[PDB]
Amino acid sequence: RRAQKHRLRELKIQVKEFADKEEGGDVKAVCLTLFLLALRARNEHRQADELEAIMQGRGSGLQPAVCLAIRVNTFLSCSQYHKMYRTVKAITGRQIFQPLHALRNAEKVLLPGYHPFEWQPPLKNVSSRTDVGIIDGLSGLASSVDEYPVDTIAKRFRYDSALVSALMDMEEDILEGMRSQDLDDYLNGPFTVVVKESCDGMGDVSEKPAVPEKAVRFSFTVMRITIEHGSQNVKVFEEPKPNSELCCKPLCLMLADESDHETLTAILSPLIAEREAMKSSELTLEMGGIPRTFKFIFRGTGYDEKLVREVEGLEASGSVYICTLCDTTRLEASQNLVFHSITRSHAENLQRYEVWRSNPYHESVEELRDRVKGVSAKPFIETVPSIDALHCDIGNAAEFYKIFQLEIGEVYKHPNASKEERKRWQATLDKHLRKRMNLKPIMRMNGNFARKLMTQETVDAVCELIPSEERHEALRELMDLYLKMKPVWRSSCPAKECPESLCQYSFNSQRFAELLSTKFKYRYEGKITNYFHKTLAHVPEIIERDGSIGAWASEGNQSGNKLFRRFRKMNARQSKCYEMEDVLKHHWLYTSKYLQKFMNAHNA
Amino acid sequence: HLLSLTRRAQKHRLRELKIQVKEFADKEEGGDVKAVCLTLFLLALRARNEHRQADELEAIMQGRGSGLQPAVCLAIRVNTFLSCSQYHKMYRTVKAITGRQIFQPLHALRNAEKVLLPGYHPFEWQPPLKNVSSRTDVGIIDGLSGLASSVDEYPVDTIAKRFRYDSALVSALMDMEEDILEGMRSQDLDDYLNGPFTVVVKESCDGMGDVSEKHGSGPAVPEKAVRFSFTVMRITIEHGSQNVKVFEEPKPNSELCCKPLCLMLADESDHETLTAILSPLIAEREAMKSSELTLEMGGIPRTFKFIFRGTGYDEKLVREVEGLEASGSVYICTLCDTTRLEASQNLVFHSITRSHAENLQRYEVWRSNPYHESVEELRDRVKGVSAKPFIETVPSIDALHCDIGNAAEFYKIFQLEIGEVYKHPNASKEERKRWQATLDKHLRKRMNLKPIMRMNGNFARKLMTQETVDAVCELIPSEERHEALRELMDLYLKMKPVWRSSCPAKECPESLCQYSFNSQRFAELLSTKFKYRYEGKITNYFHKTLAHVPEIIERDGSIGAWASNQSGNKLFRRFRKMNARQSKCYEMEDVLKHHWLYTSKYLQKFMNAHNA
Ligand SMILES: [Ca+2]
Ligand SMILES: [Ca+2]
Ligand SMILES: [Ca+2]
Ligand SMILES: [Zn+2]
Ligand SMILES: [Zn+2]
């Protein structure tokens, strides 16, 4: 101590006077900087980084929101976190992870049912309380033996108290958006939220077999928050990647089929009641001090073709009537390929069901169905007509994979070989393509199978299998017209990212239509599949209507399905009446934005 | 301030002070700039009397601060079933938020893993260990031991991975280093001492039931797997004259201390592939019975000898691996030559007269047929040996089968005496169902217990109480029956705690003696007052309980310490599903590496150091 100072005291007084004579007498700063530069020089920056942290005076422990970010974004249990916490605290003495109770006390801020809020005018048929979280999803549907039997389980939040917490976990993101867009921070204009709604059945959830059980989630997302300052509208907040895995928030879930129509209406009726309530109101709610006012715009878009065909009240997908957007039969599509419009709203379908029920013109079913254009049920969900982006691409992939298997067998020379040539054609196709591209033969086509197979190189491989020569022209021209056509709907913002193909798309599409109708009319002379109608005829109207096609798709809901199985398999109380509380709660906590701001700390 | 400046800027500022301190460092100390910078900066902080930063920086430069030495975070990763990438998520998040590298990165964690697996330490064998390779660093080798998968050969579709026996034995000896040093400190020997230590090692192989991960669709297939494992049970040493116990393993039939040696996805009853994969391990175990290990734990060379005991085989598998008849044999006990008739007759006096050498001799007698007898006189010439024995086993019992056999005799004794069948010897089966139904309703009405068909542990324990026989005894008249059943129940509760002791030399030495007395009294009363229970049927459990208990107690020293339900299958599924690769050839490598690394004593020390 004193003696070891006395060993090197000559340097001590030397460096001391050196620090007084030039650096003034700030001995501590120049000596610590000397130790930093002398310890970094031997490449041991770990000690220097922690020593800079201990001189800066930063705490060793963690805030409970960081601990909750760790416990949710890593899928630990609530019993293994206790293991990690107790032995970290025991080994390094000072605690770094918080205990479980201060974690759950910091959980209740981020769920629905914590904040005060009020509507103006108050909502009809909706309760006025502010502090309800997870309710039973059956909505008091009575289960006595005298009535209709039910056995499903469902949980949900309210709709308004979900939107309140979903707005106040992104308070920082709209405040920084107002700062970066040259607006005054103390503003309380009528903000408009744009909410994209999505619902998709995700069956085969069960774990054991011979009894498959299914499930249905109903979810939403925020997509654009916009204030009207002065005389213009500005995008205060915009979504980075809309159809992402972790930016759609769960709102209701149930264990039922997508086709059990009575149960599905019994659960999704109160949510549509609340949604139709909050379309003529203003939510006043504090956003950093002063209260602000929100007004919502709902677009229900993230439905696949079967769900959008069922709840909007149409005939099923194998109909004579194909388009959910227009009213033309499939025998009318193959003649006029691209000149259609969009004329299937929701209220039009509701009055057409009223026409079907009343039968006011006194005519039989064969012309009444033609008069109402195949509407034969009461539609009960307000949805906008659109096309998807995922299932469209997978459908086009399987369709010209089938045309590859057709063109191997040379049907243009002689038709109608029986169903024994075709299995050989399939075998030679996937054997050849596995030989060249190493693509394993898969029954259920995915999107990655599309991303590999939709390639000019594989076209050249099947060209090396198909005998003739002009078929290479009639196949390669088709494939590069399709590859030119794809990124106008695959893109998330094709108004600015690919504004070349988007302007050349009409010419590029009608040329494709002509090449399908001339050199391929041995398949498309009568029938045509649904997705070649949507991709060809409508998308230069959906672009000018909305913008993207890829942003308004169910890829988030389709990507979230593993989180159901994982959360249920590792984090649940195993009682089937609490078991859907916990899956919903964890899937709420996962896709918060206040927690993903911590797991991107290293990016900052 | 000078604090907030860039390191290039700070370099340009104090370049001359750096020149002066480095020139003093090589004009006085000879260029040890870090130590003199430590002294000057530490004293420049210490002069302001802020000792807290001095203690914290001392703990840093020692390394005892908030550091988490990589074995600790390896223990965290492997004992809470984290993956690899999710650990990387946790590490980069806590490092970016806190600023200091508190969790260690991946590659340092892998380098701290390689020390604990086999294939790190050098060693040698003082006799050079015939038919065993002499290299020191083989890890996981293919468990089939170079079999023939050729199509012209025998068909084989199993997957096996294993370590070598001597390599895994070296690693399991080197993993318990500090525990053996603290062992000889606690008995007050030197902390440096050459050998030889005698290492008593338990041997065990048993099945694992199912492992199928078939999500749903349809029941894909069974897929039964089985492992081969061992346990460093105790370690002794002598100092000239007297042995002394430097290590004793406290929880013997645990799950944390059963180190895996071989894993195969083969059925237990498939005999050929089982003995195919087990034969190299038996070759190495017969190799190391006559050698010496040189091992360099405390900086000095020490010598190790070994003793192997195979007590960890279940009773269905000791009758297969030693060559007895499988299940329906008249020869029931796996220690003596007693037929089922004499085991029904001579209840108490028996002695253990089976081994491995005379079993091999009896198999050769069955093969050679040296007396030209018929098949039946051959069968009672060799006392049940039909197959060729190939694993030296030392079989034993465990307490659950003992008191389950006692309860399954006592339940039928109660049903028989409750209806006075000793005077009415010819009953019909529905009358036995009637007696059973009266006993079931009366026991649920008096003791409030739901009876059941299959007999398990807690039901067999709580049925054998004094209040149970004194509650059922009022349903039978003729109080001679009451006092006789009272005497028999008192005899049973006297005979209970000897195999409920785990060390009966220290628990109950009074009841350890006169076990022959109470056992002969049990036989004399069960054949004297109950001279109607002889239906020619006696289980093997009741025989081993009544006859072969004191020979086992003098043999090993315990009863339920050298034996063995569902504890491994959950661990196998947890390691195969969460943290493993695919491809069926790396999959077994990863599950064997994790099942080795989970069961160390080093990592368990760091894990349950919270309640020290
Ligand atoms: Ca679907
Ligand atoms: Ca789906
Ligand atoms: Ca077993
Ligand atoms: Zn249309
Ligand atoms: Zn016996």
PDB file of N, CA and C in Angstrom, chain B residues 37-87:
ATOM      1  N   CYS B  37       1.376   1.246 -14.367  1.00  0.00           N
ATOM      2  CA  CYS B  37       0.187   2.056 -14.597  1.00  0.00           C
ATOM      3  C   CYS B  37      -0.910   1.702 -13.604  1.00  0.00           C
ATOM      4  N   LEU B  38      -1.023   0.411 -13.264  1.00  0.00           N
ATOM      5  CA  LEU B  38      -1.922  -0.050 -12.209  1.00  0.00           C
ATOM      6  C   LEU B  38      -1.601   0.606 -10.877  1.00  0.00           C
ATOM      7  N   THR B  39      -0.321   0.606 -10.493  1.00  0.00           N
ATOM      8  CA  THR B  39       0.069   1.193  -9.212  1.00  0.00           C
ATOM      9  C   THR B  39      -0.176   2.696  -9.182  1.00  0.00           C
ATOM     10  N   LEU B  40       0.199   3.409 -10.249  1.00  0.00           N
ATOM     11  CA  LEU B  40       0.065   4.865 -10.239  1.00  0.00           C
ATOM     12  C   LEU B  40      -1.397   5.301 -10.299  1.00  0.00           C
ATOM     13  N   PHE B  41      -2.211   4.662 -11.146  1.00  0.00           N
ATOM     14  CA  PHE B  41      -3.604   5.074 -11.264  1.00  0.00           C
ATOM     15  C   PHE B  41      -4.425   4.608 -10.062  1.00  0.00           C
ATOM     16  N   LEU B  42      -4.134   3.410  -9.540  1.00  0.00           N
ATOM     17  CA  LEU B  42      -4.804   2.931  -8.339  1.00  0.00           C
ATOM     18  C   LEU B  42      -4.460   3.784  -7.131  1.00  0.00           C
ATOM     19  N   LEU B  43      -3.216   4.256  -7.034  1.00  0.00           N
ATOM     20  CA  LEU B  43      -2.876   5.112  -5.908  1.00  0.00           C
ATOM     21  C   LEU B  43      -3.420   6.521  -6.104  1.00  0.00           C
ATOM     22  N   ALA B  44      -3.557   6.964  -7.359  1.00  0.00           N
ATOM     23  CA  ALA B  44      -4.178   8.258  -7.626  1.00  0.00           C
ATOM     24  C   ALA B  44      -5.666   8.249  -7.306  1.00  0.00           C
ATOM     25  N   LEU B  45      -6.313   7.087  -7.399  1.00  0.00           N
ATOM     26  CA  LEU B  45      -7.692   6.992  -6.922  1.00  0.00           C
ATOM     27  C   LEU B  45      -7.748   6.773  -5.413  1.00  0.00           C
ATOM     28  N   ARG B  46      -6.813   5.987  -4.871  1.00  0.00           N
ATOM     29  CA  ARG B  46      -6.823   5.605  -3.465  1.00  0.00           C
ATOM     30  C   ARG B  46      -6.468   6.765  -2.543  1.00  0.00           C
ATOM     31  N   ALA B  47      -5.701   7.744  -3.031  1.00  0.00           N
ATOM     32  CA  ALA B  47      -5.367   8.909  -2.221  1.00  0.00           C
ATOM     33  C   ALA B  47      -6.587   9.756  -1.887  1.00  0.00           C
ATOM     34  N   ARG B  48      -7.620   9.738  -2.733  1.00  0.00           N
ATOM     35  CA  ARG B  48      -8.885  10.402  -2.444  1.00  0.00           C
ATOM     36  C   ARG B  48      -9.797   9.553  -1.562  1.00  0.00           C
ATOM     37  N   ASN B  49      -9.285   8.416  -1.067  1.00  0.00           N
ATOM     38  CA  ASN B  49      -9.915   7.579  -0.040  1.00  0.00           C
ATOM     39  C   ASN B  49     -11.237   6.983  -0.513  1.00  0.00           C
ATOM     40  N   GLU B  50     -11.331   6.715  -1.812  1.00  0.00           N
ATOM     41  CA  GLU B  50     -12.493   6.039  -2.381  1.00  0.00           C
ATOM     42  C   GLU B  50     -12.085   4.596  -2.659  1.00  0.00           C
ATOM     43  N   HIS B  51     -12.159   3.776  -1.610  1.00  0.00           N
ATOM     44  CA  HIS B  51     -11.657   2.408  -1.671  1.00  0.00           C
ATOM     45  C   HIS B  51     -12.544   1.487  -2.500  1.00  0.00           C
ATOM     46  N   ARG B  52     -13.786   1.898  -2.777  1.00  0.00           N
ATOM     47  CA  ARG B  52     -14.742   1.041  -3.475  1.00  0.00           C
ATOM     48  C   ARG B  52     -14.273   0.727  -4.889  1.00  0.00           C
ATOM     49  N   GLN B  53     -13.798   1.749  -5.603  1.00  0.00           N
ATOM     50  CA  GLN B  53     -13.273   1.526  -6.941  1.00  0.00           C
ATOM     51  C   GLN B  53     -11.990   0.709  -6.901  1.00  0.00           C
ATOM     52  N   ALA B  54     -11.234   0.804  -5.803  1.00  0.00           N
ATOM     53  CA  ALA B  54     -10.042  -0.022  -5.643  1.00  0.00           C
ATOM     54  C   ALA B  54     -10.398  -1.493  -5.468  1.00  0.00           C
ATOM     55  N   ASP B  55     -11.397  -1.800  -4.630  1.00  0.00           N
ATOM     56  CA  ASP B  55     -11.806  -3.195  -4.464  1.00  0.00           C
ATOM     57  C   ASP B  55     -12.425  -3.751  -5.738  1.00  0.00           C
ATOM     58  N   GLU B  56     -13.204  -2.931  -6.450  1.00  0.00           N
ATOM     59  CA  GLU B  56     -13.833  -3.405  -7.679  1.00  0.00           C
ATOM     60  C   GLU B  56     -12.803  -3.645  -8.775  1.00  0.00           C
ATOM     61  N   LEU B  57     -11.785  -2.791  -8.862  1.00  0.00           N
ATOM     62  CA  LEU B  57     -10.778  -2.989  -9.893  1.00  0.00           C
ATOM     63  C   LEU B  57      -9.831  -4.121  -9.515  1.00  0.00           C
ATOM     64  N   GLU B  58      -9.640  -4.349  -8.212  1.00  0.00           N
ATOM     65  CA  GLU B  58      -8.898  -5.521  -7.762  1.00  0.00           C
ATOM     66  C   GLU B  58      -9.637  -6.801  -8.118  1.00  0.00           C
ATOM     67  N   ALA B  59     -10.962  -6.803  -7.963  1.00  0.00           N
ATOM     68  CA  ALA B  59     -11.746  -7.971  -8.349  1.00  0.00           C
ATOM     69  C   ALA B  59     -11.772  -8.154  -9.863  1.00  0.00           C
ATOM     70  N   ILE B  60     -11.620  -7.064 -10.624  1.00  0.00           N
ATOM     71  CA  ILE B  60     -11.514  -7.194 -12.076  1.00  0.00           C
ATOM     72  C   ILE B  60     -10.174  -7.793 -12.479  1.00  0.00           C
ATOM     73  N   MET B  61      -9.069  -7.203 -12.010  1.00  0.00           N
ATOM     74  CA  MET B  61      -7.751  -7.670 -12.434  1.00  0.00           C
ATOM     75  C   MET B  61      -7.417  -9.026 -11.823  1.00  0.00           C
ATOM     76  N   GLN B  62      -8.102  -9.394 -10.741  1.00  0.00           N
ATOM     77  CA  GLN B  62      -8.113 -10.781 -10.306  1.00  0.00           C
ATOM     78  C   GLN B  62      -9.034 -11.626 -11.177  1.00  0.00           C
ATOM     79  N   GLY B  63     -10.151 -11.058 -11.624  1.00  0.00           N
ATOM     80  CA  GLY B  63     -11.143 -11.795 -12.376  1.00  0.00           C
ATOM     81  C   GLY B  63     -12.321 -12.276 -11.562  1.00  0.00           C
ATOM     82  N   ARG B  64     -12.420 -11.870 -10.297  1.00  0.00           N
ATOM     83  CA  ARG B  64     -13.488 -12.306  -9.407  1.00  0.00           C
ATOM     84  C   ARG B  64     -14.670 -11.346  -9.401  1.00  0.00           C
ATOM     85  N   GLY B  65     -14.700 -10.390 -10.326  1.00  0.00           N
ATOM     86  CA  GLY B  65     -15.779  -9.424 -10.374  1.00  0.00           C
ATOM     87  C   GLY B  65     -17.016  -9.957 -11.063  1.00  0.00           C
ATOM     88  N   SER B  66     -17.755  -9.087 -11.749  1.00  0.00           N
ATOM     89  CA  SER B  66     -18.971  -9.498 -12.449  1.00  0.00           C
ATOM     90  C   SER B  66     -18.603 -10.096 -13.805  1.00  0.00           C
ATOM     91  N   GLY B  67     -17.917 -11.229 -13.749  1.00  0.00           N
ATOM     92  CA  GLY B  67     -17.243 -11.720 -14.926  1.00  0.00           C
ATOM     93  C   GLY B  67     -17.905 -12.883 -15.619  1.00  0.00           C
ATOM     94  N   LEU B  68     -18.389 -13.855 -14.838  1.00  0.00           N
ATOM     95  CA  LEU B  68     -18.972 -15.101 -15.336  1.00  0.00           C
ATOM     96  C   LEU B  68     -17.976 -15.860 -16.218  1.00  0.00           C
ATOM     97  N   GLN B  69     -16.983 -16.462 -15.550  1.00  0.00           N
ATOM     98  CA  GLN B  69     -16.051 -17.428 -16.130  1.00  0.00           C
ATOM     99  C   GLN B  69     -16.804 -18.452 -16.972  1.00  0.00           C
ATOM    100  N   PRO B  70     -16.303 -18.808 -18.167  1.00  0.00           N
ATOM    101  CA  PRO B  70     -17.142 -19.467 -19.191  1.00  0.00           C
ATOM    102  C   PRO B  70     -17.769 -20.792 -18.807  1.00  0.00           C
ATOM    103  N   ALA B  71     -17.237 -21.479 -17.797  1.00  0.00           N
ATOM    104  CA  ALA B  71     -17.876 -22.695 -17.317  1.00  0.00           C
ATOM    105  C   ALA B  71     -19.221 -22.396 -16.673  1.00  0.00           C
ATOM    106  N   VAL B  72     -19.371 -21.204 -16.091  1.00  0.00           N
ATOM    107  CA  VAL B  72     -20.632 -20.836 -15.456  1.00  0.00           C
ATOM    108  C   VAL B  72     -21.721 -20.640 -16.497  1.00  0.00           C
ATOM    109  N   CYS B  73     -21.437 -19.870 -17.544  1.00  0.00           N
ATOM    110  CA  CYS B  73     -22.469 -19.670 -18.550  1.00  0.00           C
ATOM    111  C   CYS B  73     -22.677 -20.919 -19.394  1.00  0.00           C
ATOM    112  N   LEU B  74     -21.693 -21.816 -19.442  1.00  0.00           N
ATOM    113  CA  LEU B  74     -21.956 -23.137 -20.003  1.00  0.00           C
ATOM    114  C   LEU B  74     -22.934 -23.923 -19.136  1.00  0.00           C
ATOM    115  N   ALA B  75     -22.789 -23.832 -17.810  1.00  0.00           N
ATOM    116  CA  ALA B  75     -23.740 -24.477 -16.911  1.00  0.00           C
ATOM    117  C   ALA B  75     -25.132 -23.890 -17.064  1.00  0.00           C
ATOM    118  N   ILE B  76     -25.208 -22.588 -17.331  1.00  0.00           N
ATOM    119  CA  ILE B  76     -26.497 -21.927 -17.530  1.00  0.00           C
ATOM    120  C   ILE B  76     -27.142 -22.410 -18.812  1.00  0.00           C
ATOM    121  N   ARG B  77     -26.350 -22.532 -19.872  1.00  0.00           N
ATOM    122  CA  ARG B  77     -26.903 -22.947 -21.150  1.00  0.00           C
ATOM    123  C   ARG B  77     -27.358 -24.398 -21.115  1.00  0.00           C
ATOM    124  N   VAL B  78     -26.603 -25.269 -20.453  1.00  0.00           N
ATOM    125  CA  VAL B  78     -26.941 -26.678 -20.571  1.00  0.00           C
ATOM    126  C   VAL B  78     -27.914 -27.122 -19.489  1.00  0.00           C
ATOM    127  N   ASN B  79     -28.076 -26.357 -18.412  1.00  0.00           N
ATOM    128  CA  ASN B  79     -28.980 -26.809 -17.363  1.00  0.00           C
ATOM    129  C   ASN B  79     -30.352 -26.162 -17.424  1.00  0.00           C
ATOM    130  N   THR B  80     -30.542 -25.167 -18.278  1.00  0.00           N
ATOM    131  CA  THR B  80     -31.860 -24.591 -18.488  1.00  0.00           C
ATOM    132  C   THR B  80     -32.366 -24.802 -19.899  1.00  0.00           C
ATOM    133  N   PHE B  81     -31.709 -25.681 -20.656  1.00  0.00           N
ATOM    134  CA  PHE B  81     -32.142 -26.171 -21.966  1.00  0.00           C
ATOM    135  C   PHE B  81     -32.335 -25.045 -22.977  1.00  0.00           C
ATOM    136  N   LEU B  82     -31.453 -24.060 -22.907  1.00  0.00           N
ATOM    137  CA  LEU B  82     -31.349 -23.033 -23.931  1.00  0.00           C
ATOM    138  C   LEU B  82     -30.817 -23.646 -25.213  1.00  0.00           C
ATOM    139  N   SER B  83     -31.111 -23.009 -26.332  1.00  0.00           N
ATOM    140  CA  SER B  83     -30.474 -23.368 -27.580  1.00  0.00           C
ATOM    141  C   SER B  83     -29.147 -22.635 -27.695  1.00  0.00           C
ATOM    142  N   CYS B  84     -28.597 -22.603 -28.905  1.00  0.00           N
ATOM    143  CA  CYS B  84     -27.379 -21.836 -29.123  1.00  0.00           C
ATOM    144  C   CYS B  84     -27.696 -20.411 -29.548  1.00  0.00           C
ATOM    145  N   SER B  85     -28.565 -20.252 -30.545  1.00  0.00           N
ATOM    146  CA  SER B  85     -28.854 -18.925 -31.076  1.00  0.00           C
ATOM    147  C   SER B  85     -29.634 -18.087 -30.080  1.00  0.00           C
ATOM    148  N   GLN B  86     -30.454 -18.731 -29.255  1.00  0.00           N
ATOM    149  CA  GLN B  86     -31.195 -17.987 -28.248  1.00  0.00           C
ATOM    150  C   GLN B  86     -30.278 -17.505 -27.137  1.00  0.00           C
ATOM    151  N   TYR B  87     -29.247 -18.289 -26.822  1.00  0.00           N
ATOM    152  CA  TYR B  87     -28.203 -17.800 -25.936  1.00  0.00           C
ATOM    153  C   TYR B  87     -27.475 -16.623 -26.552  1.00  0.00           C
TER     154      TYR B  87
END
